[PDB]
């Protein structure tokens, strides 16, 4: 002998929420801008020699 | 040249012989800056970028 059991309407399960995400594009390395170092080196010599 | 000439007319005679190395090196250093030197943004192909 067993106890009776009637199955009711199922309870609401917790809802799953999807997500579409697009990534951030990485930074770009700065190209090599360059100073004319030798010019100012000769400069301080000429003004000094005067 | 006027400075050296002014000193020579005044009679110091300090630039005779090796003393002349000061005017000589200066006049050469000035030549390097004005004739060759370096260009601006209009001359994009500076040695380090090319």
From Swiss-Prot, chain A:
Gene ablation phenotype (knockout): Mutants are defective in the secretion of EsxN, PPE41 and PE_PGRS proteins.
Transmembrane segments: 38-50
Compartment(s) of residence: Cell inner membrane
Role, per record: Part of the ESX-5 specialized secretion system, which is responsible for the secretion of EsxN and a number of PE_PGRS and PPE proteins, including PPE41.
Assembly and oligomerization: Part of the ESX-5 / type VII secretion system (T7SS), which is composed of cytosolic and membrane components. The ESX-5 membrane complex is composed of EccB5, EccC5, EccD5 and EccE5.
Miscellaneous information on this protein: Part of the eccB5-eccC5 operon, which is essential for in vitro growth.
Name of the protein in question: ESX-5 secretion system protein EccC5
Originating organism: Mycobacterium tuberculosis (strain ATCC 25618 / H37Rv)
Gene (name only): eccC5
Full-protein interval shown: 1 to 50 of 1391
